[PDB]
Amino acid sequence: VNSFSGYLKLTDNVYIKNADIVEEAKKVKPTVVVNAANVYLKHGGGVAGALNKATNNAMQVESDDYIATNGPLKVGGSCVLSGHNLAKHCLHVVGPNVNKGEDIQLLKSAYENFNQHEVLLAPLLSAGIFGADPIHSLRVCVDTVRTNVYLAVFDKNLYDKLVSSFL
Numbered sequence: 420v421n422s423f424s425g426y427l428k429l430t431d432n433v434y435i436k437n438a439d440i441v442e443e444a445k446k447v448k449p450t451v452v453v454n455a456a457n458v459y460l461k462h463g464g465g466v467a468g469a470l471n472k473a474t475n476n477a478m479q480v481e482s483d484d485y486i487a488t489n490g491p492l493k494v495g496g497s498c499v500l501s502g503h504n505l506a507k508h509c510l511h512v513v514g515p516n517v518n519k520g521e522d523i524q525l526l527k528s529a530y531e532n533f534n535q536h537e538v539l540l541a542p543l544l545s546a547g548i549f550g551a552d553p554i555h556s557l558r559v560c561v562d563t564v565r566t567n568v569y570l571a572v573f574d575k576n577l578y579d580k581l582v583s584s585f586l
Contacts (some may be wrong), residue, residue, distance in 0.1 A: 420448050421538060423569045429585055432567050433532045433560060437578035440466060440542055440571040441473045444505035449569075452502055452532070453467055453541035454478075455549065456511035458491040460498075465548040474503040482511070494521050495528030510536060517550030526556065530563040547573075 426434035436443070444452045455466040460482035462471035471478040481500055492498060497512040514529040515521030529544050543560065545551035552574075560568065572578040 421567075423449075426569055427582060429557075430561055432565060433570065434568070435557075435565055435570045435572060435581065437573075437575050438571040439469075439573055440452075440540065441505070442471050443569075443571050444470075444502075447540065448506060449502075449538065449540040450456055450507045451510050451536045451539040452496060452506035452508075453544075454509050454511045454540070455542050455544060455547070456492070456497075456513050457516065458494060458496075458513050460486055460492070460511060466542045469510070470505065473505060475502075476511065477503050479579055495525040496579070497529075497532035506540070510539065512544060514544035514549055514556075515551070517545065518548070523555075525549060526551065526559050527563050530560055533564045533568055534559075536571075540569045540571060542571060542573075553577055553581060553583055557585065 428434055436558045441529055454470050462479050474582050492513050494513050494515055497510055500509050502509045512529050512532050515525040524546050534540055543556040546553040546556050
């Protein structure tokens with residue numbers, strides 16, 4: 420038993436809710452919240468900009484130190500940093516950005532990072548301003564992640580479309 424509430428169960432291990440991931444993280448304080456990161460951990464917009472704003476920019480300060488030490492992530496890769504006031508940990512995962520021409524096949528590699536964590540609160544990778552089809556992202560999630568994932572979908576219209584079209 421965990422504290423996630425109001426989710427629709429899609430499979431044995433994947434759950435989905437129309438929710439603001441920031442507000443959901445603040446209330447659950449999950450062990451892991453996933454950020455929709457880029458390779459530079461520049462949290463300007465989308466989910467990343469919203470999560471970082473909710474940390475009063477502490478996520479960005481920590482991220483800049485991480486990059487200065489380690490260099491950029493790989494597309495499809497991840498790193499574990501602090502969850503600040505939102506979660507114990509933040510798993511920064513880089514899905515491919517279609518608006519940069521990155522290979523969508525890397526989306527599966529991106530979701531594989533979730534398997535290193537027993538339970539996660541997450542957005543759909545490569546959705547929103549990353550330009551991929553969210554229906555496809557959900558399919559890859561279900562077919563790749565084996566650990567327990569609670570997906571927060573901000574847009575109500577998209578949430579309904581994702582549920583109604585789910586096979």
